[PDB]
Amino acid sequence: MQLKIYNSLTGEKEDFKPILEGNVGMYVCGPTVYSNVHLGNVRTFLSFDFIYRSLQYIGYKVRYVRNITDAGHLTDRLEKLEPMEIVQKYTVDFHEVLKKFNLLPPTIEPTATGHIIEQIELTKKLIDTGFAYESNGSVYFDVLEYNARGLNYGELSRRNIEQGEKKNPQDFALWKKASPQHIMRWISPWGEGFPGWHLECTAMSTKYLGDKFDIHGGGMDLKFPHHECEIAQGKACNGTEPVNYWMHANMLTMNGQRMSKSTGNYILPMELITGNNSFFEKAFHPSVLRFCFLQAHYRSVLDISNDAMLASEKGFSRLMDAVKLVDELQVSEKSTVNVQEWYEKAYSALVDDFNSPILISHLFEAVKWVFLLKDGKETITADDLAFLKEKLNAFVFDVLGLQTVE
Amino acid sequence: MQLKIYNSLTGEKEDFKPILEGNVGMYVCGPTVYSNVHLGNVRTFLSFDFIYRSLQYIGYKVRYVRNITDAGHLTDRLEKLEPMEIVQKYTVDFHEVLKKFNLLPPTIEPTATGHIIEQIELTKKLIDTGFAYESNGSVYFDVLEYNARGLNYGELSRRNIEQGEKKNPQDFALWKKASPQHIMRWISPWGEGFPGWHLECTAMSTKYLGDKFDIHGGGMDLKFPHHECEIAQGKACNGTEPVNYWMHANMLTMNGQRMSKSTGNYILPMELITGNNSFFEKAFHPSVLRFCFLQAHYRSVLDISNDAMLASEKGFSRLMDAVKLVDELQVSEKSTVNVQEWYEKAYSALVDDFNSPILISHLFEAVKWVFLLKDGKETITADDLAFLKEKLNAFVFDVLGLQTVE
Ligand SMILES: [Cl-]
Ligand SMILES: [Cl-]
Ligand SMILES: [Cl-]
Ligand SMILES: [Cl-]
Ligand SMILES: [Cl-]
Ligand SMILES: [Cl-]
Ligand SMILES: [Zn+2]
Ligand SMILES: [Zn+2]
Numbered sequence: 088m089q090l091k092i093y094n095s096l097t098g099e100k101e102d103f104k105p106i107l108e109g110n111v112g113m114y115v116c117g118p119t120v121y122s123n124v125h126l127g128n129v130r131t132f133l134s135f136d137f138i139y140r141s142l143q144y145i146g147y148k149v150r151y152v153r154n155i156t157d158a159g160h161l162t163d164r165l166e167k168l169e170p171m172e173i174v175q176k177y178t179v180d181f182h183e184v185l186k187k188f189n190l191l192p193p194t195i196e197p198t199a200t201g202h203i204i205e206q207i208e209l210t211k212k213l214i215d216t217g218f219a220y221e222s223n224g225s226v227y228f229d230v231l232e233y234n235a236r237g238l239n240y241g242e243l244s245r246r247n248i249e250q251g252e253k254k255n256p257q258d259f260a261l262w263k264k265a266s267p268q269h270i271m272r273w274i275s276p277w278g279e280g281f282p283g284w285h286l287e288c289t290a291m292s293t294k295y296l297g298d299k300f301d302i303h304g305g306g307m308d309l310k311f312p313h314h315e316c317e318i319a320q321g322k323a324c325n326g327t328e329p330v331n332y333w334m335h336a337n338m339l340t341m342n343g344q345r346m347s348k349s350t351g352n353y354i355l356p357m358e359l360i361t362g363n364n365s366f367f368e369k370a371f372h373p374s375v376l377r378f379c380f381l382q383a384h385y386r387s388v389l390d391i392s393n394d395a396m397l398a399s400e401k402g403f404s405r406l407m408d409a410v411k412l413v414d415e416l417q418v419s420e421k422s423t424v425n426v427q428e429w430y431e432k433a434y435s436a437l438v439d440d441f442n443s444p445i446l447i448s449h450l451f452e453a454v455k456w457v458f459l460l461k462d463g464k465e466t467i468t469a470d471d472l473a474f475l476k477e478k479l480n481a482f483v484f485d486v487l488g489l490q491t492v493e
Numbered sequence: 494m495q496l497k498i499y500n501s502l503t504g505e506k507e508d509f510k511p512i513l514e515g516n517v518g519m520y521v522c523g524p525t526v527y528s529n530v531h532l533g534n535v536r537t538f539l540s541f542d543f544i545y546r547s548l549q550y551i552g553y554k555v556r557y558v559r560n561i562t563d564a565g566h567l568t569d570r571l572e573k574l575e576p577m578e579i580v581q582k583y584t585v586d587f588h589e590v591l592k593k594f595n596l597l598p599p600t601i602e603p604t605a606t607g608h609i610i611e612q613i614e615l616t617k618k619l620i621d622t623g624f625a626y627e628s629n630g631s632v633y634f635d636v637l638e639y640n641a642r643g644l645n646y647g648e649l650s651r652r653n654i655e656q657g658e659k660k661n662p663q664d665f666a667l668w669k670k671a672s673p674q675h676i677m678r679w680i681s682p683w684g685e686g687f688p689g690w691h692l693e694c695t696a697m698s699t700k701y702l703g704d705k706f707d708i709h710g711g712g713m714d715l716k717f718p719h720h721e722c723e724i725a726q727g728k729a730c731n732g733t734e735p736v737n738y739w740m741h742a743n744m745l746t747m748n749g750q751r752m753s754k755s756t757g758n759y760i761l762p763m764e765l766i767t768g769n770n771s772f773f774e775k776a777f778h779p780s781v782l783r784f785c786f787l788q789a790h791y792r793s794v795l796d797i798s799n800d801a802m803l804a805s806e807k808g809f810s811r812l813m814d815a816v817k818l819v820d821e822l823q824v825s826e827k828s829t830v831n832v833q834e835w836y837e838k839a840y841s842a843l844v845d846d847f848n849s850p851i852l853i854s855h856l857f858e859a860v861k862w863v864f865l866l867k868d869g870k871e872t873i874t875a876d877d878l879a880f881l882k883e884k885l886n887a888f889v890f891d892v893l894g895l896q897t898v899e
Contacts, residue, residue, distance in 0.1 A: 110571050150571055150578075164703050165516050165556055171601045171701065172556075179598045182588070192585045195577045200607045204679055273610055295577065297570050 090145060090438040092302070093386060095243060095310065095333040100440050103332065105301055111142050111149040112296040114330075116288060116305035116313070117196070119156040119163045120177040124184055126356050127339035127346060131306045133377060134336045134385035136190040136488060138304070138441050144486050145438065152295050153193040158200045158271055159263070160284035170271045184356050187373045189488045195295050199287040203273050206282050206290040209324055210261045210275075218323040222252040224264030224278040230257040233319055240319050243333060244311035259316050261286045285316035289324070292317070298325035307335040340390045341366060359391075367393050371400065372492045378403045381443040381487055406450065407491060409457035410483055413476045416457065419466035424456050426471045430478050437486065446482065453479050496551060496844040498708070499792060501649060501716065501739040506846050509738065511707055517548050517555040518702040520736075522694060522711035522719070523602070525562040525569045526583040530590055532762050533745035533752060537712045539783060540742045540791035542596040542894060544710070544847050550892050551844065558701050559599040564606045564677055565669070566690035576677045590762050593779045595894045601701050605693040609679050612688050612696040615730055616667045616681075624729040628658040630670030630684040636663040639725055646725050649739060650717035665722050667692045691722035695730070698723070704731035713741040746796045747772060765797075773799050777806065778898045784809045787849040787893055812856065813897060815863035816889055819882045822863065825872035830862050832877045836884050843892065852888065859885050 090103040105111055115135045118124050132153075142149045156163075157174040199206075210226050213219035219228050230240050231254070240257070241247055250256065260283040265272035272279045292300065298321070305314060314333065321329030338345075344352045354364050362370030379399035383389040429452055436445035453475060459465040467475070483489050496509040511517055521541045524530050538559075548555045562569075563580040605612075616632050619625035625634050636646050637660070646663070647653055656662065666689040671678035678685045698706065704727070711720060720739065727735030744751075750758045760770050768776030785805035789795040835858055842851035859881060865871040873881070889895050 107571055112571050148571075150575075164701060165513055165518050165554075165706075169556075169601065169701060171603065175598065175601050192581065195575065195581050197577065198604075198607065201604065204609060208680070274614070295570060295575060300571075 088435060088438060091440055092332050092334065093440045094331075095335050101332070103301075105147070106297075106299065106331070109146070109148055111147045111302065112300035113139065113142070113149055113151045113302040114288075114292040114296060114300065114304065115151070115153045115193075116309055117154040117156065118177075118181050119160050120174050120181060121161075121163055122177060123355055124177070124181045125346070126354060126359065128306065129184060129188060129356050130339050130380055130389060131304075131336040132185060133188055133190060133380055135304045135334075136188075137381060137443060137486070138334070138385070139191060139193075140486050140488055141437055141441055144481065150195070150296065151193040152195045152197065152292060154288060154291050155196060155198045156284070156287065157198045158203070159282040159287060160199075161269075162284070168270070187360065188356075188377050189374060189490055191488070197291045197295065199282060199291070200271075202287070202290050202294065203282060205294055206286050207262070207273075207275050209286060209290050209320070212324055213261065213320070216323065219261055220254070221277050224280060225252060225260055226262040226277060226283075227253050227258040227260055228316070228319065228323075229254060230259075230319075231255050233323060238319065238322050241311075241315060243315050243318055246311065259283065259285060259312060261320075285313055286320055288313075289317050289320040289329070293321065293325070293329060299327050299329055299331070301330075302332045302334060303330040304334040304336070307337055310335055334385075336385050338388050340388060342392050343390055367396060371396060374490050374492060375400045375403045378406075378447075378487070378489060382447060384440075384442060384444055386440075402451075403489075406454055406483065406489075409454040410479065410491070412457050412461055413472070413479065416460050416467065416472060417463075418469045418472055420468065422467045422471040423465045424460075424467060424471075426453075426467075426475045426478075429453055429456075430474075433478070433482060437482075443487065447487075450479065450482055494841060494844060497846055498738050498740065499846045500737075501741050507738070509707075511553070512703075512705065512737070515552070515554055517553045517708065518706035519545065519548070519555055519557045519708040520694075520698040520702060520706065520710065521557070521559045521599075522715055523560040523562065524583075524587050525566050526580050526587060527567075527569055528583060529761055530583070530587045531752070532760060532765065534712065535590060535594060535762050536745050536786055536795060537710075537742040538591060539594055539596060539786055541710045541740075542594075543787060543849060543892070544740070544791070545597060545599075546892050546894055547843055547847055550887065556601070556702065557599040558601045558603065558698060560694060560697050561602060561604045562690070562693065563604045564609070565688040565693060566605075567675075568690070574676070593766065594762075594783050595780060595896055597894070603697045603701065605688060605697070606677075608693070608696050608700065609688060611700055612692050613668070613679075613681050615692060615696050615726070618730055619667065619726070622729065625667055626660070627683050630686060631658060631666055632668040632683060632689075633659050633664040633666055634722070634725065634729075635660060636665075636725075637661050639729060644725065644728050647717075647721060649721050649724055652717065665689065665691060665718060667726075691719055692726055694719075695723050695726040695735070699727065699731070699735060705733050705735055705737070707736075708738045708740060709736040710740040710742070713743055716741055740791075742791050744794050746794060748798050749796055773802060777802060780896050780898060781806045781809045784812075784853075784893070784895060788853060790846075790848060790850055792846075808857075809895075812860055812889065812895075815860040816885065816897070818863050818867055819878070819885065822866050822873065822878060823869075824875045824878055826874065828873045828877040829871045830866075830873060830877075832859075832873075832881045832884075835859055835862075836880075839884070839888060843888075849893065853893075856885065856888055 091100045092103045094101050139151045219226050233240055262280050265279045265281055271281055341352055346353055358364040360373055379396055433446055433449040436442045436449055460467055497506045498509045500507050545557045625632050639646055668686050671685045671687055677687055747758055752759055764770040766779055785802055839852055839855040842848045842855055866873055
């Protein structure tokens with residue numbers, strides 16, 4: 088049956104209907120490469136990797152854009168320190184981490200510094216159209232004028248709760264004047280400055296996907312102000328909503344507690360992989376970690392603990408044992424298991440807002456069958472075996488993105 | 494003793510003298526990511542990886558900039574094909590290839606699209622200064638005026654051998670008008686266009702290293718026109734030579750013949766690694782391939798063949814066997830080998846224009862000693878053994894960039 092996606096705009100699961108048949112344009116907010124990528128951000132990027140893989144298995148042609156914030160968003164020549172040196176250091180580490188977790192590369196991976204010119208044009212566009220105003224070298228988005236025209240700022244997060252350069256405190260910066268402390272700067276119509284965080288993603292998303300595209304993803308912390316500002320920028324620039332489906336991935340906790348460097352309940356991705364940490368009793372292969380992650384729904388809070396990870400590992404091994412045993416299973420003239428029925432149960436879970444936990448459970452029905460088949464307690468024809476092998480590898484390696492561990 | 498570097502400007506080995514004590518600024522021309530990275534380009538990037546590593550072992554603080562040409566140099570929205578999709582595909586593959594060959598990441602890795610704004614300013618600079626002129630939306634560098642002022646175009650390649658928009662046929666483009674066929678374009682003072690290849694590297698090199706920096710590297714095919722144009726651009730912009738030491742890596746051949754897709758004498762890096770090719774009789778670990786490469790001097794032509802690679806592999810194994818056997822060697826009260834003398838021979842080869850073949854030969858003296866030590870035919874004190882272990886691992890893993898193969 089057809090795919091359903093939870094949409095943060097409406098708070099309900101919706102029939103997914105693409106703007107262009109057989110095609111999906113998809114944008115996910117990427118890392119700010121001024122420090123090491125956090126584990127919770129890895130989960131978000133892994134969740135949208137799974138979603139990207141699933142959209143392709145279903146047969147869509149998916150253009151997946153995921154940006155890199157290498158300029159601005161500071162809220163996050165040999166003797167002079169170089170911002171681009173830092174950017175390079177954490178960009179490389181970011182890609183090494185994601186490669187270990189077997190994430191596919193996105194179709195396009197634009198950088199904010201790669202699109203200053205496009206962002207300066209959008210700022211001009213919003214100034215000339217009345218949605219923005221220059222103030223002491225910066226440019227701010229006029230929230231109250233945006234509202235007076237009826238465009239409803241806050242429709243995503245559904246909130247109205249809670250300096251001198253701005254007409255109103257809720258105005259946000261599209262362009263910021265560079266102070267002498269700012270090394271990264273660019274000439275512009277308003278002096279030397281650097282981009283506002285939110286306008287980077289609007290310039291980059293619409294350039295490669297259009298004024299309106301199917302899916303926009305990110306962590307739930309981006310819902311406000313970031314994604315709220317992307318919506319307002321897109322509606323004020325193009326006169327239409329930029330995104331039909333807004334997807335938000337949920338938090339990650341450890342031992343039921345929030346991940347905090349200040350609390351001490353903190354662990355970097357590599358520390359969890361290598362076991363160089365005091366929360367987990369061993370090292371863990373990233374595919375085991377990925378398996379564990381996918382046992383939680385991307386909109387659920389994922390909690391990692393030593394006992395939960397060990398349980399995921401035991402379940403991971405059983406799955407892969409069956410995967411190896413399929414190539415050696417014997418064949419009978421009749422099948423006492425219904426592979427067609429299992430695949431329909433597995434597939435429906437997948438197109439039910441990418442329900443990886445339920446999908447994994449249906450995979451265990453096939454795992455249980457493989458060990459039963461091996462001991463002659465069940466039988467299977469050659470055609471059903473070929474079908475079982477194709478579907479099970481496709482779910483395990485292509486959709487879930489798991490991989491074998493020697 | 495002190496480092497000597499061959500300089501293409503003078504055609505001789507020169508005492509290396511840095512612009513700033515204990516520091517090296519270093520720029521190497523990077524790949525054009527519109528196709529798969531060629532093996533010969535891998536050799537060039539591997540040669541400068543070795544050089545980068547060697548400059549650090551010697552104790553210099555090295556800022557290594559290596560660019561990416563993701564816009565322009567074409568001489569090299571869901572339904573519309575996307576240049577940035579292609580760029581992304583071959584950028585990822587480029588980094589995966591180099592990671593397999595154990596190259597370090599450069600300190601900064603700028604992209605041409607990341608610096609359109611800086612390149613537009615340099616073009617203005619050269620127009621206002623008389624070195625360049627607008628012509629039908631493009632901007633061209635005036636070679637004859639550059640020469641009339643005495644700046645000698647051609648000092649690098651030492652040549653003068655061998656359309657309607659240009660004052661003279663030797664003029665080269667700093668900025669090119671975009672035709673409707675060009676998807677990649679940018680607004681500018683002269684209309685919509687895209688950067689000229691040569692001016693990308695001048696804007697990017699000087700921004701992160703200064704108006705004059707120590708070393709500029711690249712393949713020997715870049716000497717003209719590319720590096721000749723970088724010299725002219727830097728001298729016309731800044732009134733001084735941009736580079737004190739010009740380094741050029743030489744060609745790669747297979748079976749004594751030129752690598753050509755048209756000839757059929759062609760092999761991609763991954764095909765050589767995986768053995769999925771008809772020139773080599775097996776697969777080869779990239780560290781073995783890297784060892785083979787470093788047995789040729791970076792300014793020599795490297796020829797790869799099945800018999801040469803097998804010989805390199807046999808020599809690679811012997812080296813690593815000794816490397817493993819050092820931790821188990823027994824110690825005596827006296828040393829019948831002079832580790833101090835060997836290290837001085839090994840180090841002098843290194844600072845003799847990065848003479849990896851000679852350095853590897855001196856490493857085999859230490860390899861020969863390790864097998865002799867194991868059989869009691871030679872002796873060594875504990876202090877000499879500790880020194881031998883430190884220097885030999887440092888040359889093998891840190892300088893040569895080799896790695897163990899399980
Ligand atoms: Cl972002
Ligand atoms: Cl703001
Ligand atoms: Cl997840
Ligand atoms: Cl280049
Ligand atoms: Cl030209
Ligand atoms: Cl070499
Ligand atoms: Zn964003
Ligand atoms: Zn270059």
